[PDB]
Design a protein around this ligand. Structure first.
Ligand SMILES: Cc1c(C)c2c3c4c1OP(=O)(O)Oc1c(C)c(C)c5c(c1C4)Cc1c(c(c(C)c(C)c1OP(=O)(O)O5)OP(=O)(O)O2)C3
Ligand SMILES: Cc1c(C)c2c3c4c1OP(=O)(O)Oc1c(C)c(C)c5c(c1C4)Cc1c(c(c(C)c(C)c1OP(=O)(O)O5)OP(=O)(O)O2)C3
Ligand SMILES: OC[C@@]1(O)OC[C@@H](O)[C@@H](O)[C@@H]1O
Ligand SMILES: OC[C@@]1(O)OC[C@@H](O)[C@@H](O)[C@@H]1O
Ligand SMILES: [Zn+2]
Ligand SMILES: [Zn+2]
Ligand SMILES: [Zn+2]
Ligand SMILES: [Zn+2]
Length: 90
């Protein structure tokens, strides 16, 4: 078995974020033009997907973390990771 990843990027530098699900936990690695460093994201999950969009130069990141049949959305909007309103019936 193997770790599972999800990736997003934005701009032309670019910024890149790679999320890795390992051991029921998702962590984050970051590229902003000058080497890979560890990001603030740390949430439970066996499976991860991600999307992001810009408003002007402000990134908005949504990470979908799944454990069992429960998927939780995590939101980055410039000032801390918050829990999003996403729900599903799995
Ligand atoms: C935590 C975890 C994940 C995230 C998994 C799988 C397993 C898993 O539980 P684990 O405790 O590792 O138990 C297993 C052990 C010990 C072995 C030896 C296994 C498998 C599993 C089951 C089956 C398995 C799985 C795979 C993939 C890609 C392979 C090749 C694969 O066969 P292989 O590695 O020979 O055989 O999918 P993936 O890794 O994404 O999903 C399924
Ligand atoms: C507790 C447990 C259950 C109930 C599972 C699975 C696993 C499992 O974890 P574990 O056995 O510790 O880790 C694995 C290990 C050590 C190996 C070598 C595995 C698998 C697993 C994953 C993958 C796997 C699973 C299967 C089936 C039918 C096969 C053939 C099957 O490939 P197999 O050649 O055995 O590879 O479904 P099953 O209903 O058994 O579901 C999936
Ligand atoms: O500059 C790094 C950082 O703030 O970028 C936005 C998000 O990816 C955060 O988790 C991360 O720590
Ligand atoms: O600002 C957070 C939020 O409203 O952003 C858009 C969607 O991701 C929603 O689920 C989420 O709660
Ligand atoms: Zn393996
Ligand atoms: Zn898988
Ligand atoms: Zn687990
Ligand atoms: Zn905004």
């Amino acid at each position: 078995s193997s770790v599972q990843t999800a990736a997003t990027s934005w701009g032309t530098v670019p910024s890149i974020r790679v999320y890795t699900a390992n051991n029921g936990k998702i962590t984050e690695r970051c590229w902003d033009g000058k080497g890979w460093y560890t990001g603030a994201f740390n949430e439970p999950g066996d499976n991860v997907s991600v999307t992001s969009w810009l408003v002007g130069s402000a990134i908005h990141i949504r990470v979908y973390a799944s454990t069992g049949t429960t998927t939780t959305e995590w939101c980055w909007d410039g000032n801390g990771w918050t829990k999003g309103a996403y729900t599903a019936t799995n």
